Amino acid sequence: PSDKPVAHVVANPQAEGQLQWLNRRANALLANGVELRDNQLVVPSEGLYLIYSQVLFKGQGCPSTHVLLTHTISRIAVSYQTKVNLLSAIKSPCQAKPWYEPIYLGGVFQLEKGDRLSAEINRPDYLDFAESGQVYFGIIAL
Amino acid sequence: ECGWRIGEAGTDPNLNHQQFRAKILSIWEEC
């Protein structure tokens, strides 16, 4: 258990228009091989992995259109460029009052060494960073 | 919420990479 891959990274509030994961060792957990490269978690060894992610959206009001918020976790095979959706979730913050839409994702999948994992959203312009620590992205080798 | 339990474990200083892993898998089991 002390050798099993584990990673837990949080978002970078200083990024504009991106969901970028902090690579600073002072606030990023990358233990037993897994690494953060190109804003992606890299699987160091084949096996089953619990993969999870949470994002927090906030807004001050409701524009005319139902602003649809999406959050997805995808995989990119080690030797190819095909990205596959593993997890996904949609929300509708609106149907003058501030709003708050949290979207969490999770599930166990069989991953291969070198596979690249990415947690993404569609509207980074509604991201929030006031709840520092609750916008994260991690994997855990079973 | 289970999302916020995951987050609290991620920011718990008293969890090393071993203990943190066990904590999460425990949360995920009942979540």
UniProtKB/Swiss-Prot annotation, chain A:
Residues 1-142 are extracellular. Residues 5-142 form the THD domain. Changing S79F: Biologically inactive. It is found in: Secreted. Disulfide bonds join C62-C94. Changing L29F: Biologically inactive. Changing V84 to A/D: Biologically inactive. This is Tumor necrosis factor, soluble form. The gene is TNF. The chain holds residues 84 to 233 of 233 of the full protein.
